[PDB]
Amino acid sequence: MGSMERASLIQKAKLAEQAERYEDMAAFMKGAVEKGEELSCEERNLLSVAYKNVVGGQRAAWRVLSSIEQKSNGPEVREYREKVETELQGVCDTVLGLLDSHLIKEAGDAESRVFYLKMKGDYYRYLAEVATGDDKKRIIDSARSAYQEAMDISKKEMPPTNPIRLGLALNFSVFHYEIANSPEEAISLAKTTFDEAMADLHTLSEDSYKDSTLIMQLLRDNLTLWT
Template identity: 50%
Template sequence: MADTQKSRDHFLFIARLAEQSKRFDDMAEAMNSVVKLGVELTAEERNLLSVGYKNVLGAKRASRRILSVIKSKEEASGNMEHAASANESLKRVEDELTAKCNEILLTIDDYLLPLSKTGEAAVFYHKMKGDYYRYLAEFKSDADRQEATSQSLKAYEAATAIAESDLPPTNPIRLGLALNFSVFHYEIMANTERACNMAKQAFDDAAAELDSLDQNSYQDSTLILRLIGDNLTLWTPDPEEDEAGEQNKAVDGVSGENVKDLEIKAGDE
């Protein structure tokens, strides 16, 4: 037990050091080492794990989007040699994304969910599963995309069932789940109506209870509510624009690095 705690403390120090120096691959690796000690993670440790992987994957997702645009532009201009080089880089990044997503998904299934003892932890991990399968669905095709989409939906639904039973509407993890699940419906399922209904329900349920929260919880919840509100604004057609014949356009990358899609940090966001 003493050796386990010593190792845990060591890896946590490495993870915090890596976060401060923005070495997120090292951060994710250190937190994976903590997980494989076979211990239930604290809220802070869940947060460190999530932040590490989010930043690693966020950078790769951004690279994939840029390379995809470059490839398309080179193809459109007829420069097939440059297009082939861009495509080679794109495939390499997609392979890295697949490997990293599969790594954390196995960790969640093999270690994190079996050891979770609270509803909050279970929601956190099922939400993570939904997020990482969603990242795969963003670029996979055919049967692989169908499988990633199906697994993402199942994970989000499992998280929602527990959240509605165990967590109040103002809980930041529950709100973060609603935020990301609605993005799934908007971006992956192309179901704007479902995305808006889900986001609005979460927003209204939480807003009705904000007055009962303490200051720390209030700040956490209102931050996520603002993000949900931003998405609703993007996704809801403007009647004046419709009358003028203008098309309402959603911002590209709503679930990406421009903070519309947060990995909610338990107890710290």
């Protein structure tokens, strides 16, 4: 997208969201990142929403095909599952590449750095969901390491109700439960996060209260299912 203006790529990403054209949205936001400038809060959210939709569709498809393939055990189901898996891995590698070149290294504020490291944990987590080979343990550790650095910054630099801090803790708890086979760590993280947020709600405006309590409810929903 090298010939399109940065501002035009951002505008088109917003239009693509309205049109539910998420592959386009992701391509526009990739182009915007490759302009080399840091991203504002709104622009980071556009990048994240675009790729979460793209990879979300791939993950749903991979799960359908993996289920059919497990029940089957011709080559067609495995071949097609492998095709979808390779496309998913390609998208995760693209996002991880944007974070490494060069979003994270230029992110100095806690809000941007935590945001990108949470992304890095999520996309390694999506790689781990499909991994089976010599590097599967290394993929899991890469997710853990990214989430852990994000957690360390967020506890030092953000209030316990900050929505990015809350969503990071939610996703790290899912990592523990679903990927790392650590359900007790998942439950403890979700409970401690919820309780520390509850105790900080009194400091918030009405709008911030709504933002924080929405994610707190997601923490409670997981706790209900896990306990």
